[PDB]
Design a protein around this ligand. Sequence first.
Ligand SMILES: Nc1ncnc2c1ncn2[C@@H]1O[C@H](COP(=O)(O)OP(=O)(O)OP(=O)(O)O)[C@@H](O)[C@H]1O
Ligand SMILES: Nc1ncnc2c1ncn2[C@@H]1O[C@H](COP(=O)(O)OP(=O)(O)OP(=O)(O)O)[C@@H](O)[C@H]1O
Lengths: 284, 517, 308, 517
Amino acid sequence: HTGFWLDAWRGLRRRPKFVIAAALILLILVVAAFPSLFTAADPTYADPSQSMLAPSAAHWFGTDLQGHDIYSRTVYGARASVTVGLGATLAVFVVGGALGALAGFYGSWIDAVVSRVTDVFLGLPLLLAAIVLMQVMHHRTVWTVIAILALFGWPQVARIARGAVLEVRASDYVLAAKALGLNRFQILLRHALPNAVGPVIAVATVALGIFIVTEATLSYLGVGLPTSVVSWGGDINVAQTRLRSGSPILFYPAGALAITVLAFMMMGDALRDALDPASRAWRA
Amino acid sequence: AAPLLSVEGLEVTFGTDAPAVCGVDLAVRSGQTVAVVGESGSGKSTTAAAILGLLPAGGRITAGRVVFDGRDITGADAKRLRSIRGREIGYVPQDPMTNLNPVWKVGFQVTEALRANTDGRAARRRAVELLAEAGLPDPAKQAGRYPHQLSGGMCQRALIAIGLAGRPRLLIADQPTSALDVTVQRQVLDHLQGLTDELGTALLLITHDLALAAQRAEAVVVVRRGVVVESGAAQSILQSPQHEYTRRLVAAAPSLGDILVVSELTKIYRESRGAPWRRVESRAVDGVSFRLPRASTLAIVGESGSGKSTLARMVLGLLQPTSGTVVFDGTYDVGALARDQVLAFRRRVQPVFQNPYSSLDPMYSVFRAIEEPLRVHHVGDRRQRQRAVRELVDQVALPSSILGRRPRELSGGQRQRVAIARALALRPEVLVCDQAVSALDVLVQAQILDLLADLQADLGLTYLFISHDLAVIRQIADDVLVMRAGRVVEHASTEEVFSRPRHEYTRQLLQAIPGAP
Amino acid sequence: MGWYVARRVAVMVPVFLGATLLIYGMVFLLPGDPVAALAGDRPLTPAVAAQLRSHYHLDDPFLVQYLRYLGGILHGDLGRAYSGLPVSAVLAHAFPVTIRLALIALAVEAVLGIGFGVIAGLRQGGIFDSAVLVTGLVIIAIPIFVLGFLAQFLFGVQLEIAPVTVGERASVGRLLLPGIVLGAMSFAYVVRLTRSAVAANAHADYVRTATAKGLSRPRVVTVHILRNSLIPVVTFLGADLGALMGGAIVTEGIFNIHGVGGVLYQAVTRQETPTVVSIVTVLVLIYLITNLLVDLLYAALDPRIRYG
Amino acid sequence: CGGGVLSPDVVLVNGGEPPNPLIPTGTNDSNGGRIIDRLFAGLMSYDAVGKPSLEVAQSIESADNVNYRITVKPGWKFTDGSPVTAHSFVDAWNYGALSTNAQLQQHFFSPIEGFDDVAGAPGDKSRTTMSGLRVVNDLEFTVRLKAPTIDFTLRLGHSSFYPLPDSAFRDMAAFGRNPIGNGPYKLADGPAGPAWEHNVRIDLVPNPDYHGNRKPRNKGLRFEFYANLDTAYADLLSGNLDVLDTIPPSALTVYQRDLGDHATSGPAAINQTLDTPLRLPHFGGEEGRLRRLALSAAINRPQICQQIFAGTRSPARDFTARSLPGFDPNLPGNEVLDYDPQRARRLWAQADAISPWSGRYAIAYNADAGHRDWVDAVANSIKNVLGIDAVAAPQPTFAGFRTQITNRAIDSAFRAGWRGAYPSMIEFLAPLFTAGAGSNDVGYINPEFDAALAAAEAAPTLTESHELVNDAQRILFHDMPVVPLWDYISVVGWSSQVSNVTVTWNGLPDYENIVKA
Ligand SMILES: Nc1ncnc2c1ncn2[C@@H]1O[C@H](COP(=O)(O)OP(=O)(O)OP(=O)(O)O)[C@@H](O)[C@H]1O
Ligand SMILES: Nc1ncnc2c1ncn2[C@@H]1O[C@H](COP(=O)(O)OP(=O)(O)OP(=O)(O)O)[C@@H](O)[C@H]1O
């Protein structure tokens, strides 16, 4: 009766997994956008008087070594991680989708070179390549991290988009359309973008959580974000010594880190099971 | 006494939806052949699989009984049916492609169908014997090929050989030759009918057309919406249909200047088959030349793989020919179409493609798809488009509440009707039916053929209708052109094709229709 | 087969050249003078600013230094570590323990994943299937090092039942916990994929026409299901092992395990790039070779793509 | 199978960057002294316990304990082939004790019978050789002191009385970075640009020109310059180091659990005390002595030593440290310093009869090395137990913290620890508790006590002098110018291969005989 963009909403509106993931994602987005709303304290204030205080009404999440209560420190880190993930995912979606489409639809002398390029970029495990490249940078800011991540994140989305478009190209409506005009580009847009825009959305909303995890574990080692930006995985690095003594300070930032990734993964799962169930048996 | 397989009252349902097979009945006399016939979705396979306990996930028996020599096998009991499957009741699938594990060396999938054996010496050679009596060209060499390597004509022979493993006392062959093609269907069935009487098997076979079921079997059981309609002998039913439904069904059985002149059209394929320095070509079509008068119907008939679809494209310009001329109307050359000529020409020829399920851009509204040809040439401003659509949707039946729908929510025939309407959107002068009426039940088949006949009689178009058989051509077309091996085999009017053939191929093609005179 | 591998190999050499060129380019092209970044932390003196010049040949064109670098890597000369020792000797003395850890990780992964996946797939819609799916999902979320911290804490500090520090005493009884920690992430992927594969494979037509001829339950099940469903499992297994070689680093760091992962952890936390780029290059070549092997095995198992 | 973290074959110990040129009399810190002890060899050598033994000198005789007449063995050499002769020692001592040269360890040479002539004032400094050191022949010479000093024969092994090679007294600049020594070890000299690597490491190899008490039983050391000792601890745990020589404070509660008897412990020669100058009000006269005695008796030393340091400290039984050769734990009269709030309150009651109370009592302390824990703890233990209000008062800079006391005991009573130089309690007493012997930061005046020390040093035998210094120490209990807190106890952890480590007398392990297999 209406575009597939409207009946799918109703078909998913009654999905507990989806509604839970959406609520959690909205909460994460609003806390990352407007940090200063929840409390008014400042995260970089360092009082050496209190150093290992316990949770209380005054300081909810106790205090760290130098006095920073973990509560305010566990918000701007969310802001940083979320903006990293979102920017990288948007860029990688655009680039990978565009290249995979232009490769799968045309064929000779283009899909060949694109396959060569994505195969070359496929031999590099993301973590190792990022580690090697982040050794030569002195201007370490958030933007360079987003750049280096998107530089290596695309091959998978490229492969998925290429497969999807190469499959859709083997239909008959795409032929009947060109049988009456619509030179090879306008037809490409009008008929191959909508009927295949699904799989790329699924792989992108999973690669989002992938990138978030990668950024966290990379900033943990100390070759990631600088110390100027409060961030999970770097609030953990300075808390690994006191963990072996039996004080669970480390688990509060990690507790927030292990939740956003979950909210993204179990949302990508719902979107995939709703829009492209077929490719579950031999992929993922 | 004791007729085998009296199945009074099967009432299967699929996951609390509705009774998908209502009260049916039949009794095989343990030595006779019974063929049930029914349109699509009538519930023939379902009741043929519900006997062996091969029901899919949702299915379940709810009433009725199926005795076999006198013992109810309704209580599936997957400890007892092992004492029957393969030993008393065989099976034959319908799809010859996806019914063989494709990684198991069919010579080996057969070698265990006789599992009652010593497992290591007699199998590898009794199986070759079985394939030999199955009729394959050379069983020894083909017993070492994967199922993805064989053609359709051998896959079904292998399936039949598997079926006839323990020489079952009853066979439930389920639409065997439904995906095969003619002049292979007839030979496979002739081999089967001979392989049958040597054991006494009953051979309950499912099929979907009268003329064949009567000339092949002895009794007929017609079913509509999972309900037995009638039963009796073949001659007495076909010649004397009593119920209105079977009357309609037999009445719908098919048994009884110039604008475009191609010349020496030819097309090759530079195929690559392995070693990069070892490239062999495959000549698709060659030596074709004919003429097409206006307001007429010239049709192309050929076997599976005769090179007809490529010829249709090359006529529709969507395929660059290798040599030959396809000049149209004396002005539009197809070889080197000039700049303006592409859009000056696409509006006088239009195609109609093969299946109704995959030629509709599933994300399109039935109105937004029809309007597309009316849009690309920028004719009709905003609402005269609705005018033209409301006039078109009545040239085909298509009750005008069908607008705004999606392809996913339509029936079969309506899809082809919409395709024909869209092709008729911009006043074409020639249509090209790419096996249009090939995937449909008999009733909608004859209905859309009648519709096309009317449209020709009302517009003066010229069809190039294309088929893979010869039974569906006699009351519509007027010229015929048989093709085989990429070449031309015969070109003449229909009367000389139905009375006095002139080539041994045309003969064994005519006498292969369900006519059998 | 024979003419297929001739294509599967030739399609790979360009991958190797391209990957190695990209490595040797991102360093030695971008940061202006590479000697500025190749110093790491220690101060720069003309006494050290000259030995790496002779070892890297930073005076002549990009092409010759690239090819010379490849020659040195292949001949078994990777540089000199921070402790004055050649990197090759450290790698040769460090492979055993990391191989032993990867073995137990892959073993638990494969066996547990396949077992639970087939058990869930052969009886779908079950409470067991729902439970294993949700468990795999929740496990997928946690990063590797967060799970490692949780594990070492809960099982070494609260109650001392497993060693919190695997220091050079690499008995498998002490390597058990890090192996599980490393392998759980991949085990989740495996169980999810194989469950979906079996649940989608147990309905095909050839299975129906096979069980129609009286084949025993176990025979038809095993052959006609756990061949066609186990193929993609081994494909993804090769791929994800290639992906996990790099995840091993942090789980090797946070336990003080004296293997190659610990060596790399030291080298990256103390920022000694000349001893990092070489190790990463070697790991990438190993990844590429294993991918060649797993692709060959895949094509050897399924005849459909094995046409030529 | 197998494994390993294969490591270089010398030793990897921790250290730091010595913030001074490597000259014997030019360094006064443990971070830069632990390196120069291995490069040279003086007239005596201290073993692990702290007992001397002739190393270079050949015969030492003292008829009075004043006129020492020392002979040096002939067959020695420096690492440049220069013979070690009495001229080398004479020039070293004269150059070290001269004010215009402006060295650090100058005050060592006080008792050489002429030291004032060359270190007092440029009035008669024209002769720059002290009137004590003669030379009889190139293998012997004469020393003469101011007063009978039975202990002077012991301190000869200190790193200040070391000889210097003949080719060094004109190029003290480059010698200050590339020294030349007769010691058991010798700077490293492999790949060009080695030796002092500058804020990185230092390499040492055994010296094949050494025959004495300290032949090295391993291949050499490589002192790794570090900071933030927890870094070195993690490095050790990762198989990247051999001796830690200090457990960082963050980990001294699980080192045993996670290191499994690869960690030893041993008493050291370092105590630590806080003091109140006799100047600031409410602290003078008899009432001031009572104030200090009460403050002493109102401190819970064992509780702090157990809670915070968790066993790397130990309450003090007298003013000296644990392994002092001749230390008596239970000296009669030790009860004055202990934790009895009954005594503390009764004494404050007997004390405030002259002055009721003034106000705050703050504690100034350097705040960067890390004292907050025990400072606040002792503040809480002294406050609220006697009805007082003491609190801390940090100063972030050690430079300012030291200038405050070079400001001649102004205000804000503070803490100061006193490391030891050589194994003698007289060196813990005399330099701190003397009328004018330099660092007397509370200005304690007691000629009776100084006469007691003088008579103690004026003894024929060594055990008698012990007993005398014990009784003299007991005499101090009546005054207690400062309040002792505790002594140091170090913990050392070897990694996997070195096996013969021992904490000698000051925390430094016996780097000479640590065998690595
Ligand atoms: N698993 C299932 N769930 C729901 N409905 C089912 C299921 N399996 C079969 N059906 C219903 O049973 C009917 C099958 O009857 P029938 O044998 O005519 O199908 P068919 O074999 O496709 O028809 P034909 O034999 O003409 O090709 C279908 O109309 C379908 O709606
Ligand atoms: N891409 C191709 N490469 C090589 N040969 C081809 C190719 N496409 C078609 N051919 C050859 O031309 C024939 C035509 O293709 P195809 O079989 O798909 O259609 P057709 O036989 O014309 O139509 P129908 O499906 O009605 O039999 C093939 O059977 C084959 O012999």
